[PDB]
């Protein structure tokens, strides 16, 4: 019926990129750069946050089946965003994505697009569609962050602070392989959980079950804290590796 789109962390040691001699740090870097390229290009074009995320999810899934050494990442990214726009009904012309990609990329980086940028992108759409197995519908943590937050009642300002901080964590998680490890529902919980710790909030008080200390179980069944902590650790790792700090 439907394909399985989730791998174990341990499985990422065996992507085509890894097996062609790319080390884990380099592939992680390529994923961040490609995702952020997608994010930045589409933001300049005024695209909805779901459209950006969908392109990024296509991008991440693509490089579970292909190597970064044989598919230049910024061409793939542009193609993913191009298809994402049509899937999410926020369409853009391929020439406009190229125009924006050229504005944001230096001369070396835009070299990936070769002599005919539009052609390199349009040609890839065939491989992208076959790679993602024509499973175009994608759900993102954003809708669950809001669906679950709507069921919290209490101080308007503390919950809004929780949501925005969690929302930022969602945007930052698109640069990682969490999209490939955990369903979006879990991601939304993990970011609510992380924002709660950083804000010293006790979310259970805002739920309909204020004495149920594992507040998330009423939103996402069968999620151990271990999973939420692993997600939290990976998100904060991005901040620690960079110069950026938690939004708070």
């Amino acid at each position: 019926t439907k394909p399985c789109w989730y791998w174990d962390k341990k499985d990422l040691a065996h992507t085509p990129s890894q097996l062609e001699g790319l080390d884990p740090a380099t592939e992680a870097r390529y994923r961040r750069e490609g995702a952020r390229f997608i994010f930045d290009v589409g933001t300049r074009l005024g695209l909805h946050y779901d459209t950006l995320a969908t392109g990024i999810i296509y991008f991440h899934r693509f490089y579970m089946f292909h190597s970064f050494k044989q598919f230049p990442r910024y061409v793939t990214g542009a193609c993913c965003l191009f298809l994402a726009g049509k899937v999410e009904e926020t369409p853009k012309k391929c020439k406009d994505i190229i125009k924006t990609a050229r504005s944001l990329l230096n001369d070396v980086q835009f070299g990936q697009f070769g002599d005919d940028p539009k052609e390199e992108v349009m040609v890839l759409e065939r491989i992208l569609l076959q790679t993602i197995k024509f499973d175009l519908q994608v759900e993102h943590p954003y809708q669950f962050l809001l669906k679950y937050a709507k069921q919290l009642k209490g101080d308007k300002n503390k919950i809004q602070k929780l949501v925005q901080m969690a929302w930022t964590f969602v945007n930052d998680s698109l640069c990682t392989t969490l999209s490939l490890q955990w369903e979006p529902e879990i991601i939304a919980v993990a970011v609510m959980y992380l924002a709660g710790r950083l804000c010293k909030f006790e979310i259970q008080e805002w739920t309909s079950k204020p004495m149920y200390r594992r507040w998330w179980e009423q939103f996402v069944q069968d999620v151990p804290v271990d999973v939420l902590e692993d997600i939290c650790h990976q998100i904060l790792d991005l901040y620690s590796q960079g110069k950026q700090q938690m939004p708070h």
Binding site: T1, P3, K86, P91, C94, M122, L124, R126, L136
Partner: protein, 326 residues
């Protein structure tokens, strides 16, 4: 696995013939060589490459893999032409959307004049269509091209909706700009004739009501060539749009522009007096001018006409297959 779409080749289907001409490619009848199942193949050609894979096909793939109902057509898989070996750039082969084969389309049965619907036949037909539309509406999808051609009928009497190339999600919370010219003029709601641009799911209900009346007359109800003439025909039957019956008509772009010849009174019950009472009440509610007063798909299924219809008793249309020669 069954889910790894886009890889299996079209070699696996013996192509019987070309059933129809599509929007993004022609539609073919075929038989799976392995199972003997008759299937319908929609050819998607991305070789035009003006803007890549057609969005019309993307919508149908995206939505129909989500929708599972007896009255919604099933996309079984997507198959490809023999691909160029290790030359993805030169590969211009097309993709095929595999659908379940449907014996007939409503337009064909009606236009040939080869079918007669009794009240019981219409009950079974409308219940399946409106249940299917409700499934789509509960999932917040708008068909936007409901026409006799898109309704597909198997000889058993099972009805399935088909062409979702114009379908888009509807948000009640967030009103969104939509395309004004969506449905064929004959089945187009009055709100869209005046250019709503932010339309409700009630657009599909209007179209199904036009079909309901047609099943009792064997002739479409509102046949016009131009948008103004269409508003005139609707007005002659349903009454002219006016704040008395549609308070927000004054907000619509073309209300003052597209005035009908007169401010007509509603005669729907008079001209359709030959229709059974339960149906006439259903038609009167479905063909309501104001989309916020027009009934829903669910409300049609909780009507005296369709509520007690047992779907087990399929009741097929009366289609002659012999003595039609002479």
């Amino acid at each position: 696995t069954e889910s790894d779409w886009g890889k299996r080749c079209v070699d696996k289907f013996d192509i019987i013939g070309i059933i129809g001409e599509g929007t993004y490619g022609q539609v073919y009848k075929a038989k799976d060589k392995d199972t003997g199942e008759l299937v319908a193949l929609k050819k998607v050609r991305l070789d035009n490459e003006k803007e890549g894979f057609p969005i019309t096909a993307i919508r149908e793939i995206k939505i129909l893999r989500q929708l599972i109902h007896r009255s919604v057509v099933n996309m079984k898989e997507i198959v490809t032409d023999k691909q160029d070996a290790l030359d993805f750039k030169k590969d211009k082969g097309a993709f095929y959307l595999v659908f379940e084969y449907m014996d007939h389309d409503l337009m064909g049965l009606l236009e040939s004049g080869l079918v007669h619907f009794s009240e019981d036949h219409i009950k079974s037909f409308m219940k399946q269509l409106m249940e299917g539309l409700e499934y789509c509406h509960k999932k917040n999808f708008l068909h936007r091209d409901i026409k006799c051609s898109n309704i597909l009928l198997n000889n058993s009497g099972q009805i399935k909706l088909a062409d979702f190339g114009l379908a888009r999600l509807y948000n009640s919370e967030e009103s969104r700009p939509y395309t004004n010219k969506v449905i064929t003029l004959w089945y187009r709601p009055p709100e869209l004739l005046l250019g709503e641009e932010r339309y409700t799911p009630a657009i599909d209900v209007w179209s199904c009501g036009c079909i309901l009346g047609e099943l009792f007359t064997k002739k479409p109800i509102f046949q016009a060539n131009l948008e103004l003439a269409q508003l005139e025909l609707i007005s002659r039957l349903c009454g002219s749009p006016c704040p008395a019956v549609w308070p927000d008509v004054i907000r619509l772009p073309y209300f003052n522009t597209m005035k009908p010849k007169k401010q007509y009174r509603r005669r729907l019950r008079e001209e359709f007096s030959f229709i059974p009472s339960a149906a006439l009440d259903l038609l009167d509610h479905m063909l309501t001018l104001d989309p916020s007063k027009r009934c829903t798909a669910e409300q049609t299924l909780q009507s005296d006409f369709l509520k007690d219809v047992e779907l087990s008793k399929m009741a097929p249309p009366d289609l002659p297959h012999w003595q039609d020669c002479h």
